[PDB]
Amino acid sequence: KKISGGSVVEMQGDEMTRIIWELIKEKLIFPYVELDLHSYDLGIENRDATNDQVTKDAAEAIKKHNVGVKCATITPDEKRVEEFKLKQMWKSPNGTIRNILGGTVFREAIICKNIPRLVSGWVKPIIIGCHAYGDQYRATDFVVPGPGKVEITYTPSDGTQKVTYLVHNFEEGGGVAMGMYNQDKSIEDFAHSSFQMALSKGWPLYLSTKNTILKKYDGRFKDIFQEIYDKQYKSQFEAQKIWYEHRLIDDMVAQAMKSEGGFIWACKNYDGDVQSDFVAQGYGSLGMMTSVLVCPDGKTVEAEAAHGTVTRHYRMYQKGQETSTNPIASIFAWTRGLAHRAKLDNNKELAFFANALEEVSIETIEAGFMTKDLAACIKGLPNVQRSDYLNTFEFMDKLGENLKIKLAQAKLLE
Amino acid sequence: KKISGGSVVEMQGDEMTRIIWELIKEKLIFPYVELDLHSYDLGIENRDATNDQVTKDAAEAIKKHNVGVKCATITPDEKRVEEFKLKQMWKSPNGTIRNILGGTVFREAIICKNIPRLVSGWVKPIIIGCHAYGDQYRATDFVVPGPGKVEITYTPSDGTQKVTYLVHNFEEGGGVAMGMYNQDKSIEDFAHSSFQMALSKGWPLYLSTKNTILKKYDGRFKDIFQEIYDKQYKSQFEAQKIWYEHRLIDDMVAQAMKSEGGFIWACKNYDGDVQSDFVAQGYGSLGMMTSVLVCPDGKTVEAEAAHGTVTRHGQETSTNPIASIFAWTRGLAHRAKLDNNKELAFFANALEEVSIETIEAGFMTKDLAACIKGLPNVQRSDYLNTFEFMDKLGENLKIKLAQAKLL
Ligand SMILES: NC(=O)C1=CN([C@@H]2O[C@H](COP(=O)(O)OP(=O)(O)OC[C@H]3O[C@@H](n4cnc5c(N)ncnc54)[C@H](OP(=O)(O)O)[C@@H]3O)[C@@H](O)[C@H]2O)C=CC1
Ligand SMILES: NC(=O)C1=CN([C@@H]2O[C@H](COP(=O)(O)OP(=O)(O)OC[C@H]3O[C@@H](n4cnc5c(N)ncnc54)[C@H](OP(=O)(O)O)[C@@H]3O)[C@@H](O)[C@H]2O)C=CC1
Ligand SMILES: CCCC[C@H](CC(=O)O)C(=O)C(=O)O
Ligand SMILES: CCCC[C@H](CC(=O)O)C(=O)C(=O)O
Ligand SMILES: [Ca+2]
Ligand SMILES: [Ca+2]
């Protein structure tokens, strides 16, 4: 029979990533794994039909079943509202999910030996732990229409006092203003997730803030990270001959730029978004990256495809024209999610399947079979001929062909 | 007879970059240029002694004389306060001077033909325009001691809209919160500075925000840039076959990493700080970069060393002085442009050529030697110490100026 997968929360996406999402299930997953799939359509039209409530419901389902796999989704702008006749410009589904689940988003490049790096020195991988809560991505911003006073206040729950901070006094014209926050318990979980990842990988840990300018806001990050390290992880880091050190964000980017990789980089929410694409593009391809949210409870995770929905290929697919879409990021979202499922269920067979699918993906590309984007990384786009790459279905066919071989060879071992 | 330099405002710095600052004046500037130098000791000890008033006075002198050159300074924190026994944890001198002067900080790599780039495709130079006003670098942040409400409010001086927004309701434990702002007029001057720089260099311009998430805050940047572009600059951009487009910040870093350079990168205040080190390190060395604040009045300029006061610190040292030198040359070059001073303009350009020619001839400091061969495979024979490299530059500056005098 097939492998007893377990309960997995699925989040369907938009445009070309939704087409690839179904190809992965039909060709690579379902033929070998039986899943209790709790499907939530996070497509832009079902989010619009439910007033974005399906997004919140999918997050609660991940809390209940501990495993979620997410397809890439559209964050609508002004043009998207016109295109789909949306009722509202719905907020980012990833922001809503991360705000509900909390935790740390760990991102790392998907390395193939034949994909050229842009940073030649990065001979070892760089893992970024993105704090998935607060800051710019859960803030209150507004337009200041004219002269006036913008203030930010804090009132303790006991109501015994009240502190009013002056943000700015607009004396001529208007502008913008915003307020953002972060939570002590969220920063402490963010620290523990960062220290444990450095111990499981054997690499040093670096936290990047700007506490020289944000003395109180970022100073909380530096103090919490430093307090937890000295009390619970100091001797453990010294045992594995590693370390933890705080860095200014501007110095950290340049430090990582000229390093040789091999370290954990704990980033605040906004820096994690910016610099993970900096790392992904530096290793070769922006789309060759994993993105797994690790919740503070230590049992719930959300694996996702972090790139876009590839609109240009979706337009070609609807006109029946040939496309060449890279599915690796969407594939590794399934494997990373199924791997954690097998860890929680002690499923030896599901764990072997997830790792085997990741091997087949890497081995197929390293054998010379790849989509057009990966061929352009090697030969350069103006030098890419049609015989240099495979289309969307040819590449999925090659993966399923090689996955079927590797899984069959493993059966002949009893 | 030396060159009549004119009135220049000087800002002295901290630690090693202060030592280099005096060596540049002693060995490169003073022997050839006579200056009405307005000196302001922005050292951490004198800032503490004057309760940071010397920083505000220096910023105001820049308004009056239109040209200032700044040495790298210490921004104190907890470890620095205990070190110098400071009264307060003084704010950044650059944050104060920029908040007073306003304008755009343009940063660009100092290119030497024999320095290897970490990003191979970058064959054309990238120029970052940093909005020097507002955002996290002029914000109000604080620690939330416990449960309670954090609200942000806008009270109009003449209007009917006393609006209150809930920032967050802390229900368990405490945390942190902050409020920040920006100004329409400052964003507009930031827009014009970006469009005009792209037309003077003949390159396309890109603006990076995160307006998909910060719809109102960052949407204002994108709307103001697009409105000024369509009304006052789109025809000129099409004439030179260049363009302006808005990008998301995370998409923009990956696009720039994958590009071949040759564009202007309009950056918000925080991104301008982070990404300018990303660009400088990608072109080779973090300390080979110019940083000039251009004020919106089109005549006031502040040149600085973009890096720090030598983080990594009677022995010999070998420390790169190029960025500090170009702070002087860019300042004197603008001092000469304002004064129509041809001799001063020639001296400023000659010193920059001497600096690049010396490095391209094999004479360089230890960091640049480690750039070409790697630090572990670097010996004393591969570099010059601090005093020898400065003497080598002065030896070549005396030669270049003597050659031009006999022509
Ligand atoms: N985290 C998330 O869920 C994110 C979602 N998005 C959403 O994605 C949508 C489109 O974003 P956009 O900026 O246009 O980026 P796209 O994903 O559309 O990518 C732009 C171009 O890159 C190439 N490309 C990207 N991904 C692949 C792939 N897997 N295989 C092959 N080629 C690829 C294609 O180039 P070519 O045409 O030359 O073949 C494509 O036209 C938006 O609605 C946005 O909100 C965006 C970013 C993150
Ligand atoms: N005045 C200003 O504008 C600035 C002031 N500062 C202040 O400086 C201090 C430290 O700053 P910080 O951001 O930590 O670090 P720095 O900006 O001083 O530089 C960090 C690293 O970059 C490399 N580097 C920088 N400048 C040079 C150079 N000229 N030649 C060769 N290599 C160079 C060195 O790398 P490696 O270790 O590999 O040799 C150095 O360790 C603080 O007090 C801070 O407030 C910081 C930034 C700007
Ligand atoms: C929640 C804000 C950050 C998420 C954003 C995609 C999105 O618009 O949801 C992004 O660039 C990323 O996935 O890193
Ligand atoms: C508020 C401006 C902060 C600038 C900072 C240096 C500092 O003052 O600490 C920095 O590294 C730079 O951008 O040059
Ligand atoms: Ca991103
Ligand atoms: Ca900096």
Residue A236 CA, chain-centre distance (Å), reads 28
Can you tell me which atom of ligand 3 is nearest the CA of A75?
8
Nearest chain A Cα to B174, which residue? A184
The secondary structure of residue A383, as a DSSP letter, is G
Neighbours of A409 (CB within 10 A): 10
* Residue whose entry in the numeric block shows the structure tokens 């390190």: B281
- The CA distance from B69 to B293, in Å, is 10
Two structure tokens written together for B285: 């060395």
Which residues of chain A does B251 touch, with a Cβ-Cβ cutoff of 8 Å? Answer: 277
Nearest chain B Cα to A165, which residue? B140
Max CA distance (Å), chain A: 80
DSSP 3-state of A293 = strand
Amino acid A117 reads R
Contact (Cβ atoms closer than 8 angstroms) between residue B224 and residue B180: no
Residues 6+ apart with CB under 8 A from A8: A35, A36, A37, A38, A65, A67, A68, A69, A337, A338, A341
- The CA distance from B179 to A214, in Å, is 11
- The CA distance from A78 to A263, in Å, is 39
- The CA distance from B144 to B139, in Å, is 16
* Length reported for chain A: 414
- Long-range contacts of A228-231, Cβ-Cβ distance < 8 Å, separation of 24 or more: A228/A188, A228/A191, A228/A192, A228/A195, A229/A191, A229/A195
Rg over alpha carbons for chain B, rounded to the nearest Å, is 23
Solved with: X-ray
Q: First-to-last CA distance in chain A?
A: 16
* Residue whose entry in the numeric block shows the structure tokens 């016109």: A82
Contact (Cβ atoms closer than 8 angstroms) between residue A330 and residue A20: yes
Name the closest-CA residue to atom 25, ligand 2.
B287
Exposure of A365 in the CB half-sphere (CA atoms within 13 A): 25
Two structure tokens written together for B48: 């503490």
Residues 6+ apart with CB under 8 A from B401: B32, B347, B350
> Min CA distance, A7 vs chain B (Å)?
32
- Judge: B157–A149 Cβ closer than 8 Å, yes or no: yes
Contact (Cβ atoms closer than 8 angstroms) between residue B120 and residue B260: no
Cβ B320 under 6 angstroms from ligand 2? yes
DSSP 3-state of A237 = helix
Taking the centre of ligand 4 as the mean of its atom positions, its distance from the CA of residue B150, in whole angstroms, is 28
- The CA distance from A323 to A312, in Å, is 9
* Length reported for chain B: 407
Which of B89, B99, B118, B225 to probe the A interface (max A CBs under 10 A)? Answer: B118
Ligand closest to the CA atom of residue A213: 4
- Judge: A214–B139 Cβ closer than 8 Å, yes or no: yes
Cα dihedral A404→A410→A412→A414 (10° resolution): -150
Domain of A80, CATH number, reads 3.40.718.10
What values do phi and psi take at A306, rounded to 5?
-90, -10
Cβ B18 under 6 angstroms from ligand 2? no
Two structure tokens written together for B395: 């030896």
DSSP 3-state of B269 = helix
Rg over alpha carbons for chain A, rounded to the nearest Å, is 23
What values do phi and psi take at A117, rounded to 5?
-80, 150
> Min CA distance, A246 vs chain B (Å)?
13
- The CA distance from B321 to B111, in Å, is 15
Contact (Cβ atoms closer than 8 angstroms) between residue A218 and residue A247: no
How many CB pairs below 8 Å do chains A and B form together?
Answer: 261
Q: Which helix (H) or strand (E) holds B106?
A: strand B104-109
- Burial class from Cβ neighbours inside 10 Å (0-12, 13-18, 19+) for residue A192 reads middle
Which of B225, B308, B318, B309 has the alpha carbon at shortest distance from B265? B225
Ligand closest to the CA atom of residue A274: 5
The secondary structure of residue B214, as a DSSP letter, is S
Q: Which segments within A49-183 are labelled E, that is strand? A: 67-70, 104-109, 126-131, 140-144, 148-156, 163-170, 175-183
Which residues of chain A does B213 touch, with a Cβ-Cβ cutoff of 8 Å? Answer: 92, 95, 136-137
DSSP 3-state of A226 = helix
Contact (Cβ atoms closer than 8 angstroms) between residue A143 and residue B220: yes
> Min CA distance, A101 vs chain B (Å)?
16
Two structure tokens written together for B172: 């368990």
Query: Where do runs of H (alpha helix) occur along A44-183?
Result: 44-49, 53-65, 78-84, 93-101
- Judge: B184–A177 Cβ closer than 8 Å, yes or no: no
Strand partners, A141: A178
Amino acid A185 reads K
Contact (Cβ atoms closer than 8 angstroms) between residue B194 and residue B132: no
- The CA distance from B269 to B129, in Å, is 9
Which residues of chain B does A209 touch, with a Cβ-Cβ cutoff of 8 Å? Answer: none
Cβ B251 under 6 angstroms from ligand 3? no
Which residues of chain B does A273 touch, with a Cβ-Cβ cutoff of 8 Å? Answer: 210, 249-250
- Judge: A175–B183 Cβ closer than 8 Å, yes or no: yes
> Min CA distance, B145 vs chain A (Å)?
8
DSSP 3-state of A119 = strand
- Judge: A253–B167 Cβ closer than 8 Å, yes or no: no
Cβ A42 under 6 angstroms from ligand 1? no
Tally of domains within chain A: 1
- The CA distance from B360 to B241, in Å, is 34
Contact (Cβ atoms closer than 8 angstroms) between residue A136 and residue B214: yes
Neighbours of B342 (CB within 10 A): 10
The secondary structure of residue A117, as a DSSP letter, is P
Q: Which domain holds residue A403?
A: 3-412
- List b or e across A357-392, with b for residues whose CB sees 16 or more CB atoms inside 10 angstroms: bbebbbebbeeebbbbbbbbbbeeeeebeeeebbeb
- The CA distance from B404 to B407, in Å, is 5
- List b or e across B371-402, with b for residues whose CB sees 16 or more CB atoms inside 10 angstroms: bbeeeeebeeeebbbbeebbebbbebbeeebe
Residues 6+ apart with CB under 8 A from A16: A309, A310, A311, A313, A314, A317, A323, A325
- The CA distance from B1 to B369, in Å, is 38
Which residues of chain A does B137 touch, with a Cβ-Cβ cutoff of 8 Å? Answer: 213
Q: Which helix (H) or strand (E) holds A3?
A: strand A3-12
